[PDB]
């Protein structure tokens, strides 16, 4: 968005890193 809104990815980063670990290990439902 703006150069001022650069410290927002860091957030989505953490949630991304976690959501990442919860991909290849959580296994599918079906």
UniProtKB/Swiss-Prot annotation:
This protein is produced by a bicistronic gene which also produces the major prion protein/PRNP from an overlapping reading frame. The alternative prion protein/AltPrP (AC F7VJQ2) and PRNP have no apparent direct functional relation since a mutation that removes the start codon of the AltPrP has no apparent effect on the biology of PRNP. In mouse and hamster, the alternative initiation AUG codon is absent and is replaced by a GUG codon. Its primary physiological function is unclear. May play a role in neuronal development and synaptic plasticity. May be required for neuronal myelin sheath maintenance. May promote myelin homeostasis through acting as an agonist for ADGRG6 receptor. May play a role in iron uptake and iron homeostasis. Soluble oligomers are toxic to cultured neuroblastoma cells and induce apoptosis (in vitro). Association with GPC1 (via its heparan sulfate chains) targets PRNP to lipid rafts. Also provides Cu(2+) or Zn(2+) for the ascorbate-mediated GPC1 deaminase degradation of its heparan sulfate side chains. It comes from the Eukaryota. It is linked to Variations in PRNP are responsible of transmissible bovine spongiform encephalopathies (BSE), a class of neurodegenerative diseases that affect various mammals. These diseases are caused by abnormally folded prion proteins. BSE can be subdivided into at least three groups: classical, H-type and L-type, with the latter 2 collectively referred to as atypical BSE. Susceptibility or resistance to a BSE disease can be influenced by at least 3 factors related to the host prion protein: protein expression levels, number of octapeptide repeats, and specific polymorphisms. This is Major prion protein. It comes from Bos taurus. Monomer and homodimer. Has a tendency to aggregate into amyloid fibrils containing a cross-beta spine, formed by a steric zipper of superposed beta-strands. Soluble oligomers may represent an intermediate stage on the path to fibril formation. Copper binding may promote oligomerization. Interacts with GRB2, APP, ERI3/PRNPIP and SYN1. Mislocalized cytosolically exposed PrP interacts with MGRN1; this interaction alters MGRN1 subcellular location and causes lysosomal enlargement. Interacts with APP. Interacts with KIAA1191. Interacts with ADGRG6. The normal, monomeric form has a mainly alpha-helical structure. The disease-associated, protease-resistant form forms amyloid fibrils containing a cross-beta spine, formed by a steric zipper of superposed beta-strands. Disease mutations may favor intermolecular contacts via short beta strands, and may thereby trigger oligomerization. It is found in: Cell membrane; Golgi apparatus. The gene is PRNP. Residues 1-24 form the signal peptide. Belongs to the prion family. The chain holds residues 1 to 30 of 264 of the full protein.
